[PDB]
């Protein structure tokens, strides 16, 4: 399972962690077996003007299952007002890019 | 306003027997026809309880330690005892607890009171005199409630301070004994639990003067100290504690 | 105190049941003795450890109770075999055995 | 009722089956003990209506007709003088049937001596 | 029974096979909140005190300080509703053993079920002191004990009679 | 004599009470055994001189 | 670490008490036999063979 994350989020690629990409991007089970591999890629996956090609799910209604992938680009309702697929007050896109 | 009382008569405080008093309900749980063993801050049976008088010229308002908890007994007639003061330094430096029962209602305030050396209330022969504190700047907790209250009335209170919670237990008993504590058993009902969250190491008894100088009405109170120990309480068919056993008093009760 | 032998057995059985029920109130080193409190206060990775401590304590209590129940069952079986022998030899016949 | 607790409990194996089996063995053993002690006669003997035993009085050990429990005065006194997933199984022989067995044994030993224990 | 004994042939007798628990039909919260449901096995949450039980009207005489009542074993057997000050007994929900009474599989495949310590209205229906018996007809005749049920009750095959 | 050990041991409940009660039952059972075996007479008899 | 020592020592003590109870049952059976021999062989003459 290959992806690109932040430097402080590499502790969240682990069983039993509480965190953001653990809940809404990539969850490991409690009985997980295997190895997590992480290395710095600032020379390749970064630009001086900003490399915005890597995105994470800022907003979701519920936490993922282990080995569950969410690529659905549906809008999130962050308030009492329904969004109806349209951005607005408390209506945000779930996928935001790393700067 | 503060007033020094300079007409007192010097006398050492007395001591007497606790008998089987000072038992309170340890929790809010109903129990019927059962024998329950509980480990809590209790007053030992037949302990040495300190005796203070108010008679005319005795007016006993000393500075007493609080320790783990205080059992306060009152052989009262004609309503002289009005409240208590709790705190550590009893000034504006720390935060202190005020309990008063004036002619209308019972007031509990947690403020940084600059207390007087001789805090008191007064009855003119109507209540028109109140000299307890000179200031109150930072107040966090306020609670106004109903009036809690030969010697004719017996007032028992238990004051405990655990985890920032001040537990006050109370019992009102009709008595006709002249001078000392009657010998018998009466379980103290829980009166109030206050989330004050303040440090308490010292306490003061508040009395009321009688003016017609000043005259002290006939009253007597007793101070005992709680220790962590085990009691065996007996609950009858009606859920009332009718008898108790001190587990560490003597080998028979053990 | 004429009927102390039967009352002793009744008291022992009731006391064993009371002790076994009372052992549920013990946390056995966990934060609480209530399973619902642990499940509502902690995440499953550490709640699994707390539940495991409660399970091993309660299982040890139950095995202990079963062990003394079996020992008391052996004692009662010996007493019942003696009682059956007395019924056969004293009631259904005349015994020459002294005492 | 905790599902997570039961899932963790399944890791320990068949301990629960062992404990239930041991308790079941004890429970059947108690009934076997009662059968061995009291059910030693297959005939329910009864006393004659006329209690003419040559001066011998057995009223304190024979069942009392006035009592609904059909117990003897001694047995009635004996019964008066004895006072989270747990269940209590009732005994296979109830108290009235055990009293009936004792009554049959008493009637046999009074009317027949030791003959009923060895044959007819 | 075959699964419990790990055999395809079952001998004549009574075999403890399962456990019957009356499942909580609703969940009730009462804070100083949902409606109060009595006489049913429900989950309850009274002032943060959680549990599962049947709520019945109580004849206890709780003093004003007292809120929830505990028995000998320190389980909550009575509780005061924090909105309407009334006392309710909490009887534990009906649980019991499920035993299967059967003759040999060589003889017949008919079975009866005994719910131990469970009344018949919370589950050929016959109420015994040992529990509720389903599938065995009760007769007024008395025979020798073939399969022991309990409390003087025995079962046999002739259909299965009790 | 470790107070921290006893504080942790109190979390396990009444195991110690059960062990002490079982040992007390065994201890009184030994005296009962000796009483049943040897004390079968209430008169102390002596042989003639 | 103290919890590990507590559970080990508690398991040892439970094992000791259990085996003591089993030996107590054996000794009680032997003592009941000895009381029977005291009653039937010493206090009387027994017709029971061996
Ligand atoms: C009542 O008496 C007390 C005790 O003497 C007075 O408290 C003292 O006040 C003086 C003020 O100049 C201080 O310097 C002392 O240190 C205080 N002593 C203590 C022990 O606190 C109090 O002021 C008197 N009340 C009035 C109104 O004069
Ligand atoms: C056998 O014994 C019983 C019990 O001692 C006798 O019953 C008593 O009879 C007298 C006289 O009528 C009454 O005053 C007693 O109250 C009876 N006692 C009881 C317990 O009922 C009985 O009379 C004796 N004789 C026979 C032939 O049965
Ligand atoms: C109570 O304490 C005082 C001194 O504090 C002592 O003189 C007195 O004898 C004590 N009374 C009893 C009953 O111990
Ligand atoms: C009693 O104290 C309260 C609180 O300060 C006050 O409002 C009330 O007027 C007092 N009553 C009398 C009679 O002084
Ligand atoms: C307490 O009161 C003093 C003076 O009234 C003030 O300077 C201080 O900030 C107060 N502290 C708090 C915690 O309110
Ligand atoms: C309370 O006050 C006493 C004396 O002022 C002090 O020794 C103690 O540490 C204090 N406790 C807390 C919790 O502040
Ligand atoms: C309990 O209450 C009943 C009436 O409710 C009363 O008759 C009885 O005497 C009371 N029991 C005690 C021990 O006071």
Curated annotation (Swiss-Prot), chain E:
Binds to host ACE2. RBD also interacts with the N-linked glycan on 'Asn-90' of ACE2. Cleavage of S generates a polybasic C-terminal sequence on S1 that binds to host Neuropilin-1 (NRP1) and Neuropilin-2 (NRP2) receptors. Interacts with host integrin alpha-5/beta-1 (ITGA5:ITGB1) and with ACE2 in complex with integrin alpha-5/beta-1 (ITGA5:ITGB1). May interact via cytoplasmic c-terminus with M protein. May interact (via N-terminus) with host bilirubin and biliverdin, thereby preventing antibody binding to the SARS-CoV-2 spike NTD via an allosteric mechanism. Disulfide bonds join 41-93, 120-132, 145-154. Residues 21-32 are annotated as: Disordered. The chain holds residues 299 to 694 of 1273 of the full protein. The gene is S. Attaches the virion to the cell membrane by interacting with host receptor, initiating the infection. The major receptor is host ACE2. When S2/S2' has been cleaved, binding to the receptor triggers direct fusion at the cell membrane. When S2/S2' has not been cleaved, binding to the receptor results in internalization of the virus by endocytosis using host TFRC and GRM2 and leading to fusion of the virion membrane with the host endosomal membrane. Alternatively, may use NRP1/NRP2 and integrin as entry receptors. This is Spike protein S1. It comes from the Viruses. Glycans are attached at residues 25, 27, 106, 119, 140.
């Amino acid at each position: 399972d290959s992806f690109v994350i932040r430097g402080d989020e590499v502790r969240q690629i682990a069983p039993g962690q509480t965190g953001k990409i653990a809940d809404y991007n990539y969850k490991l089970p409690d009985d997980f077996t295997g190895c997590v591999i992480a290395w710095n890629s600032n020379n390749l996956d970064s630009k001086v003007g900003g490399n915005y090609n890597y995105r994470y799910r800022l907003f979701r209604k519920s936490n993922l299952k282990p080995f569950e992938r969410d690529i659905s680009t549906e809008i999130y309702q962050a308030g009492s007002t329904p969004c109806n697929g349209v951005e607005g007050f408390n209506c945000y896109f779930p996928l935001q890019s790393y700067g | 306003q503060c007033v020094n009382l300079t007409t007192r008569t010097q006398l050492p405080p007395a001591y007497t027997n606790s008998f089987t008093r000072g038992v309170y309900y340890p929790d809010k749980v109903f129990r019927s026809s059962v024998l329950h063993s509980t480990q809590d801050l209790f007053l030992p049976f037949f302990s040495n309880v300190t005796w203070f008088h108010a008679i005319h010229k005795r007016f006993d308002n000393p500075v007493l330690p609080f320790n783990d908890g205080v059992y306060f007994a009152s052989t009262e007639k004609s309503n002289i005892i009005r409240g208590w003061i709790f705190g550590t330094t009893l000034d504006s430096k720390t935060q202190s607890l005020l309990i008063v029962n004036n002619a209308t209602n019972v007031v509990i305030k947690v403020c940084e009171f600059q207390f007087c050396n001789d805090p008191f209330l007064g009855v003119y022969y109507m209540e028109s005199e109140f000299r307890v504190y000179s200031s109150a700047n930072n107040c966090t907790f306020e609670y106004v409630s109903q009036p809690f209250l030969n010697f004719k009335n017996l007032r028992e209170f238990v004051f405990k301070n655990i985890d920032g919670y001040f537990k006050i237990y109370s019992k009102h008993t009709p008595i006709n004994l002249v001078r000392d504590l009657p010998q018998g058993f009466s379980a103290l009902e829980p009166l109030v639990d206050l989330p004050i969250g303040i440090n308490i190491t010292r306490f003061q008894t508040l009395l009321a003067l009688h003016r017609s100088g000043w005259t002290a009405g006939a009253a007597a109170y007793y101070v005992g100290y709680l220790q962590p120990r085990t009691f065996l309480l007996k609950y009858n068919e009606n859920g009332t504690i009718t008898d108790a056993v001190d587990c560490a008093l003597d080998p028979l009760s053990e | 105190s004429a009927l102390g032998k039967l009352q002793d057995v009744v008291n022992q059985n009731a006391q064993a049941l009371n002790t076994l029920v009372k052992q549920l109130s013990s946390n056995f080193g966990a934060i609480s003795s209530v399973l619902n409190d642990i499940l509502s206060r902690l995440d499953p990775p550490e709640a699994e450890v707390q539940i495991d401590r409660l399970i091993t304590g309660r299982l040890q209590s139950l095995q202990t109770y079963v062990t003394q129940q079996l020992i008391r069952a052996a004692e009662i079986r010996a007493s019942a075999n003696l009682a059956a022998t007395k019924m056969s030899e004293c009631v259904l016949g005349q015994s020459k055995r002294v005492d | 009722d905790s599902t997570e607790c039961s899932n963790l409990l399944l890791q320990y194996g068949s301990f629960c089956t062992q404990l239930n089996r041991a308790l079941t063995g004890i429970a059947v053993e108690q009934d076997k003990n009662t059968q061995e002690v009291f059910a030693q006669v297959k005939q329910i003997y009864k006393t004659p209506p006329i209690k003419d035993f040559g001066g011998f009085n057995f009223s304190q050990i024979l069942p009392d007709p006035s009592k609904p429990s059909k117990r003897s005065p001694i047995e009635d006194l004996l019964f008066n003088k004895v006072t989270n997933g747990l269940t209590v199984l009732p005994p296979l022989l109830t108290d009235e049937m055990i009293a009936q067995y004792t009554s049959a044994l008493l009637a046999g030993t009074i009317t027949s001596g030791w003959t009923f224990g060895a044959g007819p | 029974t075959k699964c419990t004994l790990k055999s395809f042939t079952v001998e004549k007798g009574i075999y403890q096979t399962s456990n019957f628990r009356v499942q909580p039909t609703e969940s009730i919260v009462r804070f100083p909140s949902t409606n109060l449901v009595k006489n049913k096995c429900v989950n309850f949450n009274f002032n943060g005190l959680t549990g599962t039980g049947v709520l019945t009207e109580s004849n206890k005489k709780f003093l004003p300080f007292q809120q929830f009542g505990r028995d000998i074993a320190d389980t909550t057997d009575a509780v005061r509703d924090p909105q309407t000050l009334e006392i309710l007994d909490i009887t534990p929900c009906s649980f019991g053993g499920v035993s299967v009474i059967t003759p040999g599989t060589n003889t017949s495949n008919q079975v009866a079920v005994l719910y131990q310590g469970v009344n018949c209205t919370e589950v050929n229906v016959f109420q015994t002191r040992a529990g509720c018996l389903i599938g065995a007809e009760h007769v007024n005749n008395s025979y020798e004990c073939d399969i022991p049920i309990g409390a003087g009750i025995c079962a046999s095959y002739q259909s299965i009679i009790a």
